[PDB]
Amino acid sequence: GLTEEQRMMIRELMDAQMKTFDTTFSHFKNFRLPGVEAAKWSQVRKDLCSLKVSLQLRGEDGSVWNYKPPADSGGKEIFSLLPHMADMSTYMFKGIISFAKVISYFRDLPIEDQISLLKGAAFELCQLRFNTVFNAETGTWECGRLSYCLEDQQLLLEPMLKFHYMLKKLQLHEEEYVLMQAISLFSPDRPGVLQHRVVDQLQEQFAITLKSYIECNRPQPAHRFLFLKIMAMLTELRSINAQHTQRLLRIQDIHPFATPLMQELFGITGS
Amino acid sequence: GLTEEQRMMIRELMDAQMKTFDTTFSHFKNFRLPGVEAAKWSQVRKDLCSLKVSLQLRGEDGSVWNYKPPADSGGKEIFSLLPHMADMSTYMFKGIISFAKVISYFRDLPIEDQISLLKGAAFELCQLRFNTVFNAETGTWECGRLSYCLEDQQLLLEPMLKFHYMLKKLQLHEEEYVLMQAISLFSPDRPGVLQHRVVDQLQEQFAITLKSYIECNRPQPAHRFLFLKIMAMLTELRSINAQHTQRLLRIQDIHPFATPLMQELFGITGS
Numbered sequence: 001g002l003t004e005e006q007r008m009m010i011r012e013l014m015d016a017q018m019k020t021f022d023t024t025f026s027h028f029k030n031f032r033l034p035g036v037e038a039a040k041w042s043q044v045r046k047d048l049c050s051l052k053v054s055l056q057l058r059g060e061d062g063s064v065w066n067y068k069p070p071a072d073s074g075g076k077e078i079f080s081l082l083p084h085m086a087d088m089s090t091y092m093f094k095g096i097i098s099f100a101k102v103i104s105y106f107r108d109l110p111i112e113d114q115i116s117l118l119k120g121a122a123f124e125l126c127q128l129r130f131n132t133v134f135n136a137e138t139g140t141w142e143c144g145r146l147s148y149c150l151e152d153q154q155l156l157l158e159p160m161l162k163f164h165y166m167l168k169k170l171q172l173h174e175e176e177y178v179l180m181q182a183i184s185l186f187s188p189d190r191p192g193v194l195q196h197r198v199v200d201q202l203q204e205q206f207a208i209t210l211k212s213y214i215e216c217n218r219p220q221p222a223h224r225f226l227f228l229k230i231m232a233m234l235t236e237l238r239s240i241n242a243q244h245t246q247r248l249l250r251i252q253d254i255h256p257f258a259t260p261l262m263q264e265l266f267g268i269t270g271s
Numbered sequence: 272g273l274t275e276e277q278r279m280m281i282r283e284l285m286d287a288q289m290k291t292f293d294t295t296f297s298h299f300k301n302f303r304l305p306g307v308e309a310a311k312w313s314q315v316r317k318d319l320c321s322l323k324v325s326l327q328l329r330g331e332d333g334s335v336w337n338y339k340p341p342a343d344s345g346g347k348e349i350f351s352l353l354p355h356m357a358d359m360s361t362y363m364f365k366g367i368i369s370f371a372k373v374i375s376y377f378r379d380l381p382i383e384d385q386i387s388l389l390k391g392a393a394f395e396l397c398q399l400r401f402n403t404v405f406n407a408e409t410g411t412w413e414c415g416r417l418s419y420c421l422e423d424q425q426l427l428l429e430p431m432l433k434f435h436y437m438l439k440k441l442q443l444h445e446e447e448y449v450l451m452q453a454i455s456l457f458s459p460d461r462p463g464v465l466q467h468r469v470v471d472q473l474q475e476q477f478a479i480t481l482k483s484y485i486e487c488n489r490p491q492p493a494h495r496f497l498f499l500k501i502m503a504m505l506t507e508l509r510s511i512n513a514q515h516t517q518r519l520l521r522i523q524d525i526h527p528f529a530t531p532l533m534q535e536l537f538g539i540t541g542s
């Protein structure tokens with residue numbers, strides 16, 4: 001019940017996803033690993049401990065490294081995983097940038113709006129991709145040879161975590177995830193966007209395509225209001241983006257760690 | 272019931288031990304860690320898998336790294352822990368060399384015999400020190416922030432492992448361990464020793480001191496024949512030294528890894 005244009009639209013997104021989502025994280029390499037104003041530090045300390053993960057590395061040889069993070073003891077140890085997570089997020093951002101560049105509707109926007117949209121949405125698309133490797137049973141993001149496992153439902157109070165669990169429970173198709181990415185990417189109201197009307201019309205077409213996809217392929221009572229649920233999650237994701245952007249900038253202010261690509265995307269000038 | 276000379280002898284050994292045994296391994300640093308002719312390889316493969324350990328690193332910040340070694344899959348991965356163990360053994364050898372140098376009876380030997388005795392006994396003294404940090408309940412050598420845990424009584428078939436368990440069960444005093452070190456160190460029949468008679472008389476005095484120590488301080492039926500048990504263990508330790516020296520040289524032959532200090536001690540010339 002999709003139009004030809006809607007079918008072509010999904011095919012281009014799925015193509016873009018297939019070409020640019022390293023789902024096994026096989027090419028994530030050379031990353032850093034953890035070693036072997038007072039009001040600011042207090043807030044930053046709060047920000048950081050709200051998402052504790054251990055990390056597992058399975059070697060190509062069958063060996064396994066496992067890292068359990070330190071407790072907060074009033075020192076710099078709370079930052080131990082930041083270089084690694086900066087490297088992972090950087091790797092993901094590159095995939096997201098490549099994704100957007102492969103899409104015709106994106107390529108056709110002026111370069112200034114392309115940059116503005118990626119700056120506005122990179123984090124969100126990263127999270128959408130991360131959700132597809134999230135294991136809600138084990139509380140683990142399974143990134144190929146790397147695993148990030150949540151450390152021991154006071155966990156669901158954390159908006160990012162609540163987001164991943166709730167989104168996972170929707171049991172979305174690849175197509176629905178990639179349409180969510182498109183809808184997030186083509187948000188007409190990111191800071192600095194000039195072609196507000198063009199971007200708005202594109203977003204609307206992605207949303208219509210998604211709504212139609214769900215109607216054509218999901219007759220089950222469980223999936224009533226699925227389209228509206230997804231849109232609500234996208235709104236929540238935008239809120240989480242704003243929150244984590246401020247968390248990032250707060251850390252950066254007292255403890256610099258953003259990679260150049262991160263700085264570029266989050267507006268850090270280097271001065 | 273010890274003579275004054277025997278008491279002075281134990282005091283000098285205990286002093287030497289106290290000065291040169293880093294029991295917390297606090298100064299073991301900058302070590303390597305595992306990454307993130309056919310008949311020879313077959314034997315070497317057998318040699319290596321006969322002692323599997325996982326490794327734990329507790330960080331000063333409370334973080335914990337844990338390494339589980341790979342299975343043998345016909346490749347170079349069986350060597351993954353060798354650089355680390357070379358670094359640890361090297362660190363231990365330095366302590367053993369320092370131990371010997373602090374002892375009057377050793378200092379008074381000609382420099383050529385000093386070298387010959389250290390070459391002959393360094394491995395044995397290393398093992399004697401390692402036994403004092405061996406936890407027989409957990410099958411773990413507890414080396415301060417580093418732990419080496421035996422991987423899951425087919426284990427007791429391995430002579431080195433049988434040695435550590437049996438020696439631990441004797442529940443020796445610090446004094447008895449350090450006398451064992453002396454007896455091993457002053458073995459008159461290591462290759463190249465010139466002052467055979469002098470070294471022999473020294474060893475005999477350490478053994479007499481040990482026997483007297485046990486008689487003076489251990490009246491319990493459990494400790495009957497303790498001196499003879501210890502001497503039997505020293506003989507076994509010498510056998511294990513010969514075995515592991517040949518294992519080391521077999522590995523080295525197809526996969527070089529010995530540090531310069533190891534090469535020096537085990538007779539590798541660099542050519």
Ligand SMILES: C#C[C@]1(O)CC[C@H]2[C@@H]3CCc4cc(O)ccc4[C@H]3CC[C@@]21C
Pocket residue numbers: 044047048049050051082085086089090123244245247248251262
């Ligand atoms: C603070 C804080 C946190 O809640 C814990 C870790 C922080 C993330 C660290 C890495 C990272 C990378 C990005 O590209 C963007 C954001 C972040 C931080 C966001 C706030 C986090 C999750």
Ligand SMILES: C#C[C@]1(O)CC[C@H]2[C@@H]3CCc4cc(O)ccc4[C@H]3CC[C@@]21C
Pocket residue numbers: 315318319320321322353356357360361394515516518519522533
């Ligand atoms: C082979 C073999 C083994 O049984 C497994 C690991 C080998 C040790 C590796 C490091 C090391 C260092 C030394 O100074 C002396 C010997 C060794 C090797 C001995 C044989 C071992 C235990």
